[PDB]
Amino acid sequence: RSYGFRPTYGVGHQPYRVVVLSFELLHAPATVCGPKKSTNLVKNKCVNF
Amino acid sequence: RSYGFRPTYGVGHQPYRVVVLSFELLHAPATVCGPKKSTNLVKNKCVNF
């Protein structure tokens, strides 16, 4: 069935753009990552890795 | 108090028809049933009655 996308219609049938993100969570090599900066590893010292 | 059921009014106060059905659930003889066809019973056999 088609839609009556009339610009004069009220909020009763005002269309919106919609995006669905299905994040993939599993134990696998990671490709996409957030915006952080790497540092230097520290050996033989208690660190919050 | 009455209502301003104006057809030119927006979706703010557009009345709807509502039908409420209250199913009755108890261990009592059943009168209303779904659209399924009965079968013939089997004796002395493991059967999902």
Side-chain angles (χ1 to χ4, degrees):
Chain A
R1 268 74 162 174
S2 300
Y3 276 112
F5 276 179
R6 294 321 161 71
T8 65
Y9 284 168
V11 296
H13 291 284
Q14 279 180 0
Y16 306 162
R17 294 195 174 173
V18 176
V19 181
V20 177
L21 299 94
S22 167
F23 269 64
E24 191 48 279
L25 271 161
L26 74 164
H27 283 323
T31 63
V32 57
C33 279
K36 301 210 159 39
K37 277 260 157 187
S38 311
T39 52
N40 194 0
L41 61 89
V42 176
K43 284 160 47 169
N44 307 104
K45 271 187 42 71
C46 178
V47 297
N48 296 115
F49 63 89
Chain B
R1 276 80 161 180
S2 299
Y3 274 106
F5 283 165
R6 288 316 159 76
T8 68
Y9 276 173
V11 295
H13 265 268
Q14 284 182 1
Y16 294 174
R17 292 192 176 174
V18 174
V19 177
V20 172
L21 300 97
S22 172
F23 297 93
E24 193 55 278
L25 267 163
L26 76 164
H27 294 335
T31 61
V32 64
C33 281
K36 303 202 160 37
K37 282 256 157 184
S38 309
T39 61
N40 196 359
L41 61 83
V42 176
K43 282 164 48 172
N44 306 109
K45 280 182 45 71
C46 179
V47 168
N48 297 295
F49 60 92

mmCIF file of all heavy atoms in Angstrom, chain A residues 8-36:
data_model
loop_
_atom_site.group_PDB
_atom_site.id
_atom_site.type_symbol
_atom_site.label_atom_id
_atom_site.label_comp_id
_atom_site.label_asym_id
_atom_site.label_seq_id
_atom_site.Cartn_x
_atom_site.Cartn_y
_atom_site.Cartn_z
ATOM 1 N N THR A 8 1.065 18.841 4.012
ATOM 2 C CA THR A 8 0.104 19.548 4.846
ATOM 3 C C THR A 8 -0.423 18.697 5.996
ATOM 4 O O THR A 8 -1.027 19.246 6.923
ATOM 5 C CB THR A 8 -1.071 20.033 3.995
ATOM 6 O OG1 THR A 8 -1.790 18.904 3.483
ATOM 7 C CG2 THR A 8 -0.568 20.869 2.831
ATOM 8 N N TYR A 9 -0.215 17.382 5.958
ATOM 9 C CA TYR A 9 -0.699 16.522 7.030
ATOM 10 C C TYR A 9 0.031 16.818 8.335
ATOM 11 O O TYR A 9 1.189 17.242 8.347
ATOM 12 C CB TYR A 9 -0.529 15.046 6.663
ATOM 13 C CG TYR A 9 -1.550 14.527 5.677
ATOM 14 C CD1 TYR A 9 -1.379 13.297 5.058
ATOM 15 C CD2 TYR A 9 -2.694 15.253 5.385
ATOM 16 C CE1 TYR A 9 -2.315 12.812 4.163
ATOM 17 C CE2 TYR A 9 -3.634 14.776 4.490
ATOM 18 C CZ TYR A 9 -3.438 13.556 3.883
ATOM 19 O OH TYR A 9 -4.368 13.075 2.993
ATOM 20 N N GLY A 10 -0.666 16.587 9.443
ATOM 21 C CA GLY A 10 -0.112 16.815 10.758
ATOM 22 C C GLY A 10 0.798 15.685 11.200
ATOM 23 O O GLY A 10 1.191 14.811 10.423
ATOM 24 N N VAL A 11 1.116 15.698 12.493
ATOM 25 C CA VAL A 11 2.051 14.746 13.085
ATOM 26 C C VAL A 11 1.443 13.350 13.132
ATOM 27 O O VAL A 11 2.092 12.398 13.581
ATOM 28 C CB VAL A 11 2.477 15.198 14.492
ATOM 29 C CG1 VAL A 11 3.233 16.515 14.418
ATOM 30 C CG2 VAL A 11 1.263 15.325 15.395
ATOM 31 N N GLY A 12 0.196 13.217 12.679
ATOM 32 C CA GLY A 12 -0.435 11.908 12.659
ATOM 33 C C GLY A 12 0.280 10.923 11.754
ATOM 34 O O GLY A 12 0.366 9.733 12.063
ATOM 35 N N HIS A 13 0.786 11.397 10.618
ATOM 36 C CA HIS A 13 1.507 10.550 9.671
ATOM 37 C C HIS A 13 2.718 11.283 9.100
ATOM 38 O O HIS A 13 2.956 11.290 7.891
ATOM 39 C CB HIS A 13 0.583 10.064 8.558
ATOM 40 C CG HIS A 13 -0.456 9.090 9.020
ATOM 41 N ND1 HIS A 13 -0.163 7.774 9.309
ATOM 42 C CD2 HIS A 13 -1.782 9.239 9.246
ATOM 43 C CE1 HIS A 13 -1.265 7.155 9.691
ATOM 44 N NE2 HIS A 13 -2.261 8.020 9.662
ATOM 45 N N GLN A 14 3.503 11.918 9.971
ATOM 46 C CA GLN A 14 4.717 12.597 9.536
ATOM 47 C C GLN A 14 5.855 11.587 9.469
ATOM 48 O O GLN A 14 6.270 11.068 10.517
ATOM 49 C CB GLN A 14 5.069 13.733 10.486
ATOM 50 C CG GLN A 14 4.290 15.011 10.227
ATOM 51 C CD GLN A 14 4.651 16.130 11.184
ATOM 52 O OE1 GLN A 14 5.498 15.964 12.061
ATOM 53 N NE2 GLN A 14 4.003 17.277 11.022
ATOM 54 N N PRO A 15 6.389 11.282 8.288
ATOM 55 C CA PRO A 15 7.453 10.278 8.198
ATOM 56 C C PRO A 15 8.773 10.787 8.751
ATOM 57 O O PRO A 15 9.096 11.974 8.667
ATOM 58 C CB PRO A 15 7.556 10.007 6.693
ATOM 59 C CG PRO A 15 7.073 11.268 6.059
ATOM 60 C CD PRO A 15 5.992 11.789 6.964
ATOM 61 N N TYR A 16 9.538 9.862 9.326
ATOM 62 C CA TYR A 16 10.875 10.119 9.830
ATOM 63 C C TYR A 16 11.869 9.193 9.138
ATOM 64 O O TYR A 16 11.522 8.082 8.713
ATOM 65 C CB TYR A 16 10.970 9.895 11.352
ATOM 66 C CG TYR A 16 9.970 10.647 12.210
ATOM 67 C CD1 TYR A 16 9.719 10.245 13.514
ATOM 68 C CD2 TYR A 16 9.284 11.752 11.726
ATOM 69 C CE1 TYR A 16 8.812 10.916 14.309
ATOM 70 C CE2 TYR A 16 8.375 12.431 12.513
ATOM 71 C CZ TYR A 16 8.143 12.009 13.803
ATOM 72 O OH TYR A 16 7.238 12.681 14.592
ATOM 73 N N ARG A 17 13.105 9.667 9.019
ATOM 74 C CA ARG A 17 14.213 8.794 8.663
ATOM 75 C C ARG A 17 14.612 7.971 9.879
ATOM 76 O O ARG A 17 14.616 8.471 11.008
ATOM 77 C CB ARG A 17 15.407 9.613 8.174
ATOM 78 C CG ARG A 17 15.182 10.353 6.867
ATOM 79 C CD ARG A 17 16.502 10.821 6.272
ATOM 80 N NE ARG A 17 16.338 11.405 4.946
ATOM 81 C CZ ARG A 17 17.308 12.002 4.266
ATOM 82 N NH1 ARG A 17 18.532 12.108 4.755
ATOM 83 N NH2 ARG A 17 17.042 12.503 3.063
ATOM 84 N N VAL A 18 14.952 6.702 9.646
ATOM 85 C CA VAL A 18 15.262 5.747 10.705
ATOM 86 C C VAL A 18 16.489 4.945 10.299
ATOM 87 O O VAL A 18 16.587 4.474 9.160
ATOM 88 C CB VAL A 18 14.079 4.799 10.988
ATOM 89 C CG1 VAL A 18 14.470 3.753 12.015
ATOM 90 C CG2 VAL A 18 12.864 5.580 11.464
ATOM 91 N N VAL A 19 17.420 4.787 11.236
ATOM 92 C CA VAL A 19 18.616 3.974 11.065
ATOM 93 C C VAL A 19 18.680 2.985 12.221
ATOM 94 O O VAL A 19 18.460 3.358 13.378
ATOM 95 C CB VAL A 19 19.895 4.832 11.017
ATOM 96 C CG1 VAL A 19 21.117 3.957 10.805
ATOM 97 C CG2 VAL A 19 19.793 5.880 9.925
ATOM 98 N N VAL A 20 18.965 1.725 11.908
ATOM 99 C CA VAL A 20 19.106 0.669 12.903
ATOM 100 C C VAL A 20 20.532 0.149 12.831
ATOM 101 O O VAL A 20 20.986 -0.285 11.763
ATOM 102 C CB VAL A 20 18.100 -0.469 12.678
ATOM 103 C CG1 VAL A 20 18.325 -1.579 13.690
ATOM 104 C CG2 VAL A 20 16.676 0.059 12.754
ATOM 105 N N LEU A 21 21.238 0.195 13.958
ATOM 106 C CA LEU A 21 22.590 -0.335 14.061
ATOM 107 C C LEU A 21 22.544 -1.600 14.902
ATOM 108 O O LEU A 21 22.109 -1.561 16.059
ATOM 109 C CB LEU A 21 23.541 0.683 14.689
ATOM 110 C CG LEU A 21 23.744 2.010 13.968
ATOM 111 C CD1 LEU A 21 22.798 3.062 14.518
ATOM 112 C CD2 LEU A 21 25.187 2.456 14.104
ATOM 113 N N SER A 22 22.990 -2.710 14.322
ATOM 114 C CA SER A 22 23.068 -3.995 15.012
ATOM 115 C C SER A 22 24.540 -4.278 15.276
ATOM 116 O O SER A 22 25.251 -4.813 14.428
ATOM 117 C CB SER A 22 22.424 -5.098 14.184
ATOM 118 O OG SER A 22 22.749 -6.373 14.706
ATOM 119 N N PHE A 23 25.000 -3.907 16.467
ATOM 120 C CA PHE A 23 26.405 -4.074 16.801
ATOM 121 C C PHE A 23 26.738 -5.552 16.934
ATOM 122 O O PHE A 23 25.981 -6.325 17.525
ATOM 123 C CB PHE A 23 26.731 -3.344 18.100
ATOM 124 C CG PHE A 23 27.175 -1.932 17.899
ATOM 125 C CD1 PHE A 23 26.315 -1.001 17.350
ATOM 126 C CD2 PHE A 23 28.435 -1.523 18.281
ATOM 127 C CE1 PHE A 23 26.710 0.305 17.169
ATOM 128 C CE2 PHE A 23 28.836 -0.217 18.098
ATOM 129 C CZ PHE A 23 27.973 0.697 17.544
ATOM 130 N N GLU A 24 27.880 -5.948 16.379
ATOM 131 C CA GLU A 24 28.309 -7.341 16.382
ATOM 132 C C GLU A 24 29.276 -7.554 17.539
ATOM 133 O O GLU A 24 30.399 -7.041 17.522
ATOM 134 C CB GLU A 24 28.950 -7.716 15.048
ATOM 135 C CG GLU A 24 29.187 -9.214 14.847
ATOM 136 C CD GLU A 24 27.978 -10.078 15.182
ATOM 137 O OE1 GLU A 24 27.755 -10.371 16.377
ATOM 138 O OE2 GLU A 24 27.248 -10.466 14.246
ATOM 139 N N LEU A 25 28.837 -8.311 18.542
ATOM 140 C CA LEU A 25 29.614 -8.570 19.750
ATOM 141 C C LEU A 25 29.961 -10.051 19.811
ATOM 142 O O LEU A 25 29.088 -10.887 20.066
ATOM 143 C CB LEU A 25 28.839 -8.149 20.996
ATOM 144 C CG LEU A 25 29.007 -6.709 21.468
ATOM 145 C CD1 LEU A 25 27.872 -6.321 22.391
ATOM 146 C CD2 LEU A 25 30.341 -6.565 22.174
ATOM 147 N N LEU A 26 31.233 -10.372 19.597
ATOM 148 C CA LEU A 26 31.705 -11.742 19.740
ATOM 149 C C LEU A 26 33.209 -11.703 19.960
ATOM 150 O O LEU A 26 33.866 -10.686 19.726
ATOM 151 C CB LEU A 26 31.360 -12.607 18.521
ATOM 152 C CG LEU A 26 32.149 -12.407 17.222
ATOM 153 C CD1 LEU A 26 31.930 -13.586 16.287
ATOM 154 C CD2 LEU A 26 31.780 -11.110 16.531
ATOM 155 N N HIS A 27 33.746 -12.830 20.419
ATOM 156 C CA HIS A 27 35.189 -12.977 20.602
ATOM 157 C C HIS A 27 35.806 -13.217 19.230
ATOM 158 O O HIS A 27 35.867 -14.343 18.732
ATOM 159 C CB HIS A 27 35.500 -14.103 21.580
ATOM 160 C CG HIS A 27 35.270 -13.734 23.013
ATOM 161 N ND1 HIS A 27 35.551 -12.479 23.510
ATOM 162 C CD2 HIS A 27 34.769 -14.446 24.049
ATOM 163 C CE1 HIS A 27 35.246 -12.439 24.795
ATOM 164 N NE2 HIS A 27 34.769 -13.619 25.147
ATOM 165 N N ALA A 28 36.257 -12.132 18.614
ATOM 166 C CA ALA A 28 36.835 -12.154 17.280
ATOM 167 C C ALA A 28 37.745 -10.944 17.144
ATOM 168 O O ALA A 28 37.655 -10.010 17.949
ATOM 169 C CB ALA A 28 35.740 -12.140 16.201
ATOM 170 N N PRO A 29 38.646 -10.938 16.162
ATOM 171 C CA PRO A 29 39.491 -9.757 15.960
ATOM 172 C C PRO A 29 38.646 -8.510 15.747
ATOM 173 O O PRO A 29 37.627 -8.536 15.055
ATOM 174 C CB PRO A 29 40.302 -10.110 14.711
ATOM 175 C CG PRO A 29 40.363 -11.588 14.718
ATOM 176 C CD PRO A 29 39.075 -12.071 15.324
ATOM 177 N N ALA A 30 39.080 -7.413 16.356
ATOM 178 C CA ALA A 30 38.325 -6.171 16.361
ATOM 179 C C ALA A 30 38.808 -5.258 15.246
ATOM 180 O O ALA A 30 40.012 -5.045 15.083
ATOM 181 C CB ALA A 30 38.455 -5.460 17.708
ATOM 182 N N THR A 31 37.861 -4.717 14.486
ATOM 183 C CA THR A 31 38.167 -3.847 13.360
ATOM 184 C C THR A 31 37.790 -2.397 13.620
ATOM 185 O O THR A 31 38.644 -1.510 13.524
ATOM 186 C CB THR A 31 37.448 -4.348 12.099
ATOM 187 O OG1 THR A 31 36.031 -4.274 12.296
ATOM 188 C CG2 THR A 31 37.838 -5.790 11.802
ATOM 189 N N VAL A 32 36.533 -2.133 13.947
ATOM 190 C CA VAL A 32 36.101 -0.781 14.273
ATOM 191 C C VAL A 32 36.370 -0.516 15.747
ATOM 192 O O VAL A 32 36.195 -1.399 16.595
ATOM 193 C CB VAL A 32 34.615 -0.589 13.915
ATOM 194 C CG1 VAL A 32 33.758 -1.607 14.634
ATOM 195 C CG2 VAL A 32 34.164 0.818 14.255
ATOM 196 N N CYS A 33 36.820 0.697 16.056
ATOM 197 C CA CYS A 33 37.181 1.048 17.421
ATOM 198 C C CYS A 33 36.868 2.517 17.658
ATOM 199 O O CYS A 33 36.671 3.294 16.721
ATOM 200 C CB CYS A 33 38.657 0.753 17.702
ATOM 201 S SG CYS A 33 39.008 -0.980 18.073
ATOM 202 N N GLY A 34 36.821 2.889 18.930
ATOM 203 C CA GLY A 34 36.554 4.254 19.316
ATOM 204 C C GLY A 34 37.775 5.134 19.176
ATOM 205 O O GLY A 34 38.889 4.684 18.867
ATOM 206 N N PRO A 35 37.578 6.430 19.411
ATOM 207 C CA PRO A 35 38.655 7.426 19.229
ATOM 208 C C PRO A 35 39.543 7.619 20.459
ATOM 209 O O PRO A 35 39.397 8.552 21.250
ATOM 210 C CB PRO A 35 37.875 8.698 18.894
ATOM 211 C CG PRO A 35 36.546 8.525 19.598
ATOM 212 C CD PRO A 35 36.331 7.056 19.882
ATOM 213 N N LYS A 36 40.496 6.710 20.636
ATOM 214 C CA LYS A 36 41.445 6.785 21.736
ATOM 215 C C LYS A 36 42.861 6.671 21.192
ATOM 216 O O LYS A 36 43.082 6.289 20.041
ATOM 217 C CB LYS A 36 41.176 5.697 22.782
ATOM 218 C CG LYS A 36 39.786 5.763 23.389
ATOM 219 C CD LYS A 36 39.778 5.254 24.820
ATOM 220 C CE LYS A 36 38.576 5.784 25.580
ATOM 221 N NZ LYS A 36 37.355 5.811 24.727
#
